[PDB]
Amino acid sequence: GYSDRVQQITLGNSTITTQEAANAVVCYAEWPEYLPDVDASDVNKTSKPDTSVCRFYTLDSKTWTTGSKGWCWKLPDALKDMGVFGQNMFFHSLGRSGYTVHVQCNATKFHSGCLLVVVIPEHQLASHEGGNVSVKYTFTHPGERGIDLSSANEVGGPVKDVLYNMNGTLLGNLLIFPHQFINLRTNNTATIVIPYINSVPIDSMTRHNNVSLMVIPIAPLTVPTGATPSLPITVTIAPMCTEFSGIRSKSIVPQ
Amino acid sequence: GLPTTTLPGSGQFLTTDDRQSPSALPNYEPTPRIHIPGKVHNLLEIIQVDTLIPMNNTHTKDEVNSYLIPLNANRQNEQVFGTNLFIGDGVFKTTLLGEIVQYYTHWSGSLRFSLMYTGPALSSAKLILAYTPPGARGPQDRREAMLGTHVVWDIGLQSTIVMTIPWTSGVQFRYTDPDTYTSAGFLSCWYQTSLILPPETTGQVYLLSFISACPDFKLRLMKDTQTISQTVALTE
Amino acid sequence: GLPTTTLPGSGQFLTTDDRQSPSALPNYEPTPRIHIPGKVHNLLEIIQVDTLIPMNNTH
Amino acid sequence: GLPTTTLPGSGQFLTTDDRQSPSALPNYEPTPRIHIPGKVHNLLEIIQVDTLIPMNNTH
Amino acid sequence: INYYKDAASTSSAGQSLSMDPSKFTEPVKDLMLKGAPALN
Amino acid sequence: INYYKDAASTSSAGQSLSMDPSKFTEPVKDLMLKGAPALN
Amino acid sequence: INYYKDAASTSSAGQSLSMDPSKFTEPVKDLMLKGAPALN
Amino acid sequence: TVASISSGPKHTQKVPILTANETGATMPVLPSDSIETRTTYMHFNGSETDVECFLGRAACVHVTEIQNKDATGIDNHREAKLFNDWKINLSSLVQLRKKLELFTYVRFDSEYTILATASQPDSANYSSNLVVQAMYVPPGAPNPKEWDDYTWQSASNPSVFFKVGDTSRFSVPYVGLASAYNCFYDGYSHDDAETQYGITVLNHMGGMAFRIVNEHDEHKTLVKIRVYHRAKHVEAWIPRAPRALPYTSIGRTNYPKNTEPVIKKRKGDIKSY
Amino acid sequence: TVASISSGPKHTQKVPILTANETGATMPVLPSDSIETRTTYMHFNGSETDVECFLGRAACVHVTEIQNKDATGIDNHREAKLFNDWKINLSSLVQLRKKLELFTYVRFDSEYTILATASQPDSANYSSNLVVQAMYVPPGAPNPKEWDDYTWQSASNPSVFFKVGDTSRFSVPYVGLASAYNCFYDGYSHDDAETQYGITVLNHMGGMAFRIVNEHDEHKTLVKIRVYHRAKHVEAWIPRAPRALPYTSIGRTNYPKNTEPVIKKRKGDIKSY
Amino acid sequence: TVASISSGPKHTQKVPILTANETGATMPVLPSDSIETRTTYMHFNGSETDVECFLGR
């Protein structure tokens, strides 16, 4: 009586149940694991807070309306302030982590709409100015708020044009990245497990984000007659196999 | 001193030849490799992942909406969409498949075309997808369409339908850039019965459509893509 | 570095010589051969089929 | 005469390449080596000896 | 025959002949069998 | 010795030394023996 | 393959792979053990 | 091998020299069936009549020309011969063409040799040294528009750079779409009422673009390109009647009107020697 | 290998063509799951789509130019193109760039070919023969200031001397600091409020300085340098969506404003063929 | 080859970090004598610092 459909994920002191899942994706078919010695470089023993950092943090909720263009969060940024995960983050020189991402959106059998939930490794954004204008730090570190693709261009911020993925590629091809759809008629959640993907064994958690999670409405939300025209979307994310190394004074970052 | 003779071609530089060269950095030790998920070995590995087709090309500036094929409730007998199968041009051209095919001169193989339905769960519909092999015109009505490769799709719990365009061909390779002799057919879709919405519901519903290549597929003779060009060198 | 000497004829192009060359299309896979009746191997095979002589050349 | 083809790079001088050359002094016999304390083999051997840092740079 | 000492100086590598699209085409956590229902 | 990797790059082929004119000179359905009457 | 007769004409030598810093880092007459007191 | 066996007088009921040509056969009659012969050996193998040998020597297949000159103010490089393309063919210069069309389908690898020589028809202080670039442009690739377009980057398209006065040589595998190249094709690309007849992609071998890499000197320099083609690894099927009339077009069988009698008229009778 | 197996009529409870794309998988459906097929073999290996092959041909990555002229009274050699540097990149000419950015991290050895040709745009008696010097200047080395500085001694820095008109070729091991080169980097060099985004040393491949060794003749000679780069021993991870809009800058993803629709609009309906 | 071995807390009478530089030696102290380390390998030989290489271009 197991269905692909019902699932339970327990991680730390927190549990999620979905009764309307559509399997789960594990990026590149690899599950998060700690850093092996053969791959290690820094000689420091690392710190593995385990259950105090590897639990589920639910970010603040978004509201899908007929005019929504899509939202974008960066990792580990989105979690920069969650509990002890965040403290560890500002206090060590280097850290490394994988995540379980669970995006939630329920409706009824009269609604229609379909969101794309995708994880993009190394999502370098484009400046809407063109040329070689850079995208300032603050703009690519929105924190739990994430970036709202239907917000206005700002100065020093990225471009927010959806048919171009914020980088000069077409929305249609985002499907080459680990992703899952939430089609109100099928699905009510999306779950993706992200292994740590980098060109170095461990890195800085503040100067470099290693994935952007993106939720994009593709088939517009259509509510039943005289229904309220909107649904909330909630994102809950859990660091998994986290390791921190090179402890010290506590980083100070712009803004 | 051993006697030699040099042949025609001596001193030429062929950008495609593969020979040994002296290393400028004798004895240098590269950084160790660490493990990174995701290694690609063949472009054939990636063109099997499906991506969305902007089938609804009828707009005037690129929009999220050209990915949406609309469906109308209560129409009978009528046609949902049509396209030829020049995978290197037209709707296909910006898709990952289209985009890679363009790095090669010839392609052969089967294509997989699927449609995912997004209408309310309490609605229902039966569509027919038809592949018309080279030699006939794009079908003009379902009767015409239904006499070639087709699948009656019944919209249900299972949200997507995967149609295969089996390789139908005299010549074993076709050109990726559209060519007549080498042309592959048409793909059309019609109401088999009709879309029906539940009460309290209204308007258009949309289908999303994807394209990817079957394991069947072959691409050969690499060349340059018409999809990118430039007028002055870029700088930092 | 192995010492060499080049002989007279170096650099010439003789349309009748038969040597190796780099392939411009590295790794390309040609279309499979299928069977076709009629293969010719030697011109000596075909000059044994008789053909008509315009003997009455007087026109 | 063996047929050859020369590749791009022929005739270049790369200061870092390592090949054989004719000796200008054929048959010459170098002076014998005697023992000298102190032979260095790697620069890695010497950067492990500590030396003083002008830390007080303020002059 | 390599004429040179360093590995960078050797010619092109030889075909992976690796090829495994499943990391890209089927990264699902619970295995899907073709023919069995997608969602149970 | 081939110095190159691809087959197209090798020199000319070597003599068929196949030679069988009968597909061209005697494509008749019932075998004709020299010396026996042509039409029986 | 050396093409030439004299040794000077051969290419560069090959890595000492000798490496022993102690003549430079620890030329002390009585051996010092790390962890034991420097001056007893 | 015997070329002739010894044979003596005959008085038989077994006549090898009477046949019925209506059957379509060429009966294998020999000197020894009708005169008295002596033994003789062949001393010969028929080596130089092998089709690999027949089609295997380089033939000139194309002569084009490009010039190095100041492109300043040229509105159409292609038109100034600042650069030039060629869609590969083996039926434009007739010598090799008649040889290939002795067969219906032909399959082979090609070895190209490209000779480039320079000319300076009007007053120059010197002869400059130019490097030619020959790019192989398969159908669907961007085609050069100026002599120094992004196209010439040729990041995915094989190109060779050699010096004028020298020769370039490389070999291309059999690039046909079918199993053989059609020397002839009695078809169309589709059942259109006005589509072209005979010319087909079945024959298509790519295409090539040439340019000088050098910028301009004070004088002008004419560079004339000659492409030679040698078939290697030849396979030929279905022999046909040799070409009798002159050729008029690449890819059609058409001959010129009011052509001249191709059979030499006797100077004398049928009876004449 | 079979490309298709033989398969006949089906009337089952087992439907391989109905799936749920919401899952993120592309189910491996074949022609034989939905029509009746016959056996056919592949006859093909997928050799020429190997990433080593795809990135393994030389692409033009840079064109620069230097001149040989009297430096007497030149206050800024660099500025007179008496000599010139280039910080190595693969993202300035777009052909190769789009190819590499199909991947996120890439690791390979480089083989460089450098072609140098000379031009004499204004009245010269002759063409001189110049030797170019290309020095590889790693970050931290003294940089040339004049065209004949102590720098050019290059006692510790690899340099190649070749003749104009010829080509130089050498190969450099993978010089990246990390395990792969980042084709993309969503980071900064430090948490600064104004530091540059995206451009990183993670990509840095060295830098190269060119000059003519010859002193000056009576005329001036323009030498134009073209650097070609071929990846050998390629390793690529994490495929990404291909580049759709035009490029504007080395190292940023930025596209131009008021760009044009990249998807071709139908001439007709959705229903059109 | 290990570049660093794994080493944990220490509370000893054996102090490798106190020395007398007046002796002329450079005592071979390592990260693992004064912090807690994890194993890591060298992945490197020191090839390009050989004097033959240093003076050989």
DSSP-assigned letter for residue J3 = E
Nearest-angstrom CA–CA distance, A108 and I218: 86
Verify cis geometry, omega within 30 degrees of 0, for the bond prior to A158.
Answer: no
Residues of G in contact with J51 (CB under 8 A): 16
Residue bearing tokens 């650069």: H83
Q: Give the residue on H whose Cα is nearest the Cα of C10.
A: H166
B156: helix, coil or strand?
Answer: coil
Q: Is the CA virtual torsion C38, C41, C43, C44 positive or negative?
A: negative
- What pairs with residue C40 in β-bridges? H236
Q: Smallest Cβ distance to D42: which of J26, J46, J57?
A: J46
For residues H117 and H104, the answer to whether their CB atoms sit within 8 Å is no
The domain that contains F1 carries what CATH number?
Answer: 4.10.80.10
Q: One-letter amino acid identity for H128?
A: S
Nearest-angstrom CA–CA distance, H190 and H200: 11
Tell me the two tokens of residue I76.
Answer: 């800024």
Fold of A1-255: Jelly Rolls (2.60.120)
C13: helix, coil or strand?
Answer: coil
A8: helix, coil or strand?
Answer: strand
Nearest-angstrom CA–CA distance, H125 and H103: 52
- Residue partners of B87: CB distance under 8 A and separation at least 6: B97, B98, B101, B107, B111, B176, B184, B211
Q: Is the CA virtual torsion D2, D7, D12, D18 positive or negative?
A: negative
Q: One-letter amino acid identity for A139?
A: F
Report how far Cα A219 is from the mean position of its chain's Cα atoms: 21
Residue A140: HSE in the Cβ half-sphere, 13 Å Cα cutoff? 33
Nearest-angstrom CA–CA distance, A60 and A45: 35
Nearest-angstrom CA–CA distance, H215 and H223: 14
Residue I6 sits at the vertex; the CA angle it makes with I4 and I12, to the nearest 5 degrees, is 110
CA distances from I262 to A11, B9, B86, B235, H7 (A): 44, 42, 17, 24, 84
Nearest-angstrom CA–CA distance, H265 and I74: 83
- Residue partners of B52: CB distance under 8 A and separation at least 6: A171, A172, A173, A175, A218, B67, B95, B208, B209, B210
* Residue B1 sits at the chain D interface (C-beta within 8 Å): no
Nearest-angstrom CA–CA distance, G12 and A244: 46
- Residue partners of B132: CB distance under 8 A and separation at least 6: B138, B139, B145, B148, B149, B185, B186, B187, B188
* Residue E12 sits at the chain I interface (C-beta within 8 Å): yes
Report how far Cα F27 is from the mean position of its chain's Cα atoms: 14
B126: helix, coil or strand?
Answer: strand
Q: Beta H103-119 vs H221-239: how paired, if at all?
A: antiparallel
User: What was the experiment behind these coordinates?
Assistant: X-ray
Q: One-letter amino acid identity for H64?
A: T
Q: Which residues of F touch C (CB under 8 A)?
A: 2-6, 8-12, 16, 18-21, 23-25
For residues I22 and B235, the answer to whether their CB atoms sit within 8 Å is no
Best of G25, G26, G28, G34 to substitute, by most chain D Cβ atoms within 10 angstroms, is G25
DSSP-assigned letter for residue I153 = G
Q: Do chains I and F touch (3 or more CB pairs under 8 A)?
A: no
Nearest-angstrom CA–CA distance, B155 and B117: 7
- What pairs with residue A102 in β-bridges? A191, A236
Taking the CA of residue I93 and the nearest CA in chain J, the distance in Å comes to 33
Q: Give the residue on J whose Cα is nearest the Cα of G26.
A: J25
Write down all domains in chain B, each with its CATH number in brackets: 1-236 (2.60.120.20)
Nearest-angstrom CA–CA distance, B50 and A188: 22
DSSP-assigned letter for residue G36 = B
Tell me the two tokens of residue H71.
Answer: 């492109």
Contact between chains at D5 and B6 (C-beta distance less than 8 A): yes
Residues of B in contact with D17 (CB under 8 A): 22, 26
> Rg of the Cα trace of chain G?
21
For residues I50 and E18, the answer to whether their CB atoms sit within 8 Å is no
Residues of F in contact with C43 (CB under 8 A): none
Domain that holds residue G29: 1-40
Residue bearing tokens 């239907």: A150
Q: Is the CA virtual torsion A27, A28, A33, A36 positive or negative?
A: negative
For residues A43 and J40, the answer to whether their CB atoms sit within 8 Å is yes
Q: Could you tell me which chains touch chain F, where touching means 3 or more CB pairs under 8 A?
A: C, H
Nearest-angstrom CA–CA distance, H27 and B123: 80
Nearest-angstrom CA–CA distance, I63 and I226: 4
- Residue partners of B129: CB distance under 8 A and separation at least 6: B113, B115, B150, B151, B153, B161, B163, B187, B188, B189
Q: Smallest Cβ distance to A178: which of E27, E30, E38?
A: E27
Tell me the two tokens of residue A222.
Answer: 């259509």
Q: Give the residue on C whose Cα is nearest the Cα of I42.
A: C32
DSSP chain H: -EEE--------S--TT---GGGS------GGGTS----EE-----GGGBHHHHH-S-EEEEEEEEEE---TT-S-TTTTTSEEEEE--SSSSHHHHHHHTTEEEEEEEEEEEEEEEEE--S--SS----EEEEEE--BTBPPPSSTT-GGGG-SSS-EEEEEBTBEEEEEE----SSSSEES-----SSS-SS--SS--GGG---EEEEEE-S---SS-EEEEEEEEEEEEEEEEEEE-PPP-SPP-STT-----SS---SSPPPSS-SS--
Nearest-angstrom CA–CA distance, A224 and A233: 18
- What pairs with residue A182 in β-bridges? A115
| Residue I47 phi, psi (nearest 5) | -55, -45
Q: One-letter amino acid identity for H200?
A: T
Residues of J in contact with B31 (CB under 8 A): 43
Report how far Cα B94 is from the mean position of its chain's Cα atoms: 8
Nearest-angstrom CA–CA distance, I11 and I17: 13
DSSP-assigned letter for residue D46 = H
Nearest residue to I59 (alpha-carbon basis) of I32, I34, I92, I86: I92
Q: Is the CA virtual torsion H172, H177, H180, H181 positive or negative?
A: negative
Residue D31 sits at the vertex; the CA angle it makes with D27 and D35, to the nearest 5 degrees, is 145
Residues of I in contact with B111 (CB under 8 A): none
Q: Smallest Cβ distance to I43: which of C25, C27, C32?
A: C32
* Residue I54 sits at the chain D interface (C-beta within 8 Å): no
Q: What are the start-end ranges of the H helices in chain I?
A: 51-55, 94-100
H/E stretch holding B134: none
Q: One-letter amino acid identity for I33?
A: D
Residue positions counted in chain J: 57
Report how far Cα B140 is from the mean position of its chain's Cα atoms: 24
Residue H247 sits at the vertex; the CA angle it makes with H241 and H248, to the nearest 5 degrees, is 145
H/E stretch holding I134: strand I131-136
Nearest-angstrom CA–CA distance, B28 and B31: 10
A169: helix, coil or strand?
Answer: strand
Q: One-letter amino acid identity for A9?
A: I
I200: helix, coil or strand?
Answer: coil
Nearest residue to J40 (alpha-carbon basis) of H7, A202, H47, C56: A202
Nearest-angstrom CA–CA distance, A167 and I171: 33
* Residue H265 sits at the chain C interface (C-beta within 8 Å): yes
Contact between chains at I113 and D10 (C-beta distance less than 8 A): no
H/E stretch holding B138: none
Nearest residue to I130 (alpha-carbon basis) of I111, I112, I147, I155: I147
Tell me the two tokens of residue I186.
Answer: 């969503």
DSSP-assigned letter for residue I255 = -
Nearest-angstrom CA–CA distance, A124 and E20: 28
For residues I30 and B110, the answer to whether their CB atoms sit within 8 Å is yes
For residues H118 and H223, the answer to whether their CB atoms sit within 8 Å is yes
CA distances from A103 to A32, B151, C44 (A): 19, 34, 78
Q: Give the residue on J whose Cα is nearest the Cα of D48.
A: J26
* Residue B7 sits at the chain C interface (C-beta within 8 Å): yes
Q: What are the start-end ranges of the H helices in chain A?
A: 83-91
Counting runs of H as helices and runs of E as strands, what totals does chain C give?
Answer: 1, 2
Tell me the two tokens of residue D26.
Answer: 């054929």
Longest dimension (CA), chain I: 91
* Residue H237 sits at the chain B interface (C-beta within 8 Å): no
For residues J3 and J32, the answer to whether their CB atoms sit within 8 Å is no
Write down all domains in chain I, each with its CATH number in brackets: 1-273 (2.60.120.20)
Longest dimension (CA), chain C: 73
Nearest residue to E34 (alpha-carbon basis) of I18, A1, B51: I18
For residues B80 and B161, the answer to whether their CB atoms sit within 8 Å is no
CA distances from I173 to H249, I170, I206, J41, J54 (A): 53, 10, 11, 22, 18
Using a 10 angstrom Cβ sphere, with 0-12 exposed, 13-18 middle and 19 or more buried, the burial of residue D35 is exposed
Nearest residue to I130 (alpha-carbon basis) of I208, I64, I211: I211
DSSP A189-230: EEEEEE----SSSSB-SSSB--EEEEEEEEEEEEPPTTS-SE
Best of J23, J42, J49 to substitute, by most chain G Cβ atoms within 10 angstroms, is J23
* Residue I155 sits at the chain J interface (C-beta within 8 Å): yes
Nearest residue to I257 (alpha-carbon basis) of B90, B229, A153: A153
Q: Could you tell me which chains touch chain B, where touching means 3 or more CB pairs under 8 A?
A: A, C, D, E, H, I, J
Nearest-angstrom CA–CA distance, A119 and A209: 12
Residue positions counted in chain I: 273
For residues B38 and A28, the answer to whether their CB atoms sit within 8 Å is yes
Nearest-angstrom CA–CA distance, B191 and B196: 11
- Residue partners of I250: CB distance under 8 A and separation at least 6: A132, B234, B235, B236, I89, I91, I92, I199
Report how far Cα I94 is from the mean position of its chain's Cα atoms: 8
For residues I70 and E34, the answer to whether their CB atoms sit within 8 Å is no
Nearest-angstrom CA–CA distance, D37 and H112: 65
For residues I132 and I227, the answer to whether their CB atoms sit within 8 Å is no
For residues A232 and A116, the answer to whether their CB atoms sit within 8 Å is no
Number of domain units in chain F? 1
Long-range pairs for A8-13 at CB < 8 Å and ≥24 separation?
A9/A56, A9/A100, A9/A102, A9/A191, A9/A238, A11/A54, A11/A55, A11/A56, A11/A100, A11/A238, A11/A240, A12/A50, A12/A51, A12/A52, A12/A53, A12/A54, A12/A55, A12/A56, A12/A238, A13/A51, A13/A55
Tell me the two tokens of residue J20.
Answer: 């007398």
Taking the CA of residue B28 and the nearest CA in chain J, the distance in Å comes to 6
* Residue H15 sits at the chain F interface (C-beta within 8 Å): yes
Taking the CA of residue J12 and the nearest CA in chain A, the distance in Å comes to 20
Best of E12, E17, E23, E30 to substitute, by most chain I Cβ atoms within 10 angstroms, is E12
Nearest residue to A220 (alpha-carbon basis) of A252, A189, A184, A190: A184
Size of the A and B interface in Cβ pairs below 8 Å: 107
* Residue I119 sits at the chain B interface (C-beta within 8 Å): no
Nearest-angstrom CA–CA distance, I104 and I124: 50
